[PDB]
């Protein structure tokens, strides 16, 4: 239901943010995101977290809903290195975003 979804969407925002800080620290140590091992991302119980885009100086993190633990969620959440968070679903609003 919408309540469950609203909590899970709010908490995966924290997960994405935590990964983004980790990558910001990594960028200052290395000067690039190209060498980052995409299997060092912190996951979320209700969303699988991946690097949808990675370039030397920028990245986009993406959270896709877990179809087992978060069945019925279609909203995909992104966060880029610029700090812009965004969410969109499939003919479904994203509580806490729209």
The strands making up 59-65's β-sheet, listed across from edge to edge, are: 47-54, 59-65, 76-80, 85-88
SS3 16: helix
Quick one: residue 90, left, alpha or beta (phi over 0 = left, psi -120 to 50 = alpha)? beta
Read off the tokens for 59: 């990245």
How many residues in the chain? Answer: 98
Taking the domains of the chain in order of start, what are their residue ranges?
1-98
Closest listed residue to residue 15, CA positions, set 46, 37, 36 = 46
Contact 57, 33 (CB under 8 A): yes
Contact 19, 32 (CB under 8 A): no
Closest listed residue to residue 87, CA positions, set 72, 68, 65 = 65
Give the C-alpha separation, 87 to 98, whole Å: 8
Strand partners, 53: 60
């Amino acid at each position: 239901g919408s309540h469950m979804r609203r909590v899970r969407l709010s908490e995966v925002r924290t997960t994405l943010l935590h990964n983004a800080q980790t990558m910001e620290r990594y960028y200052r140590q290395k000067g690039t995101f190209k060498t980052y091992d995409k299997n060092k991302l912190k996951q979320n119980k209700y969303f699988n977290v991946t690097l949808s885009k990675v370039s030397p100086d920028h990245f986009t993190l993406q959270a896709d809903p877990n179809p087992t633990t978060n069945d019925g969620e279609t909203c995909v959440v992104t966060l880029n290195d610029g700090g812009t968070i965004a969410a969109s679903g499939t003919n479904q609003s994203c509580p806490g975003f729209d």
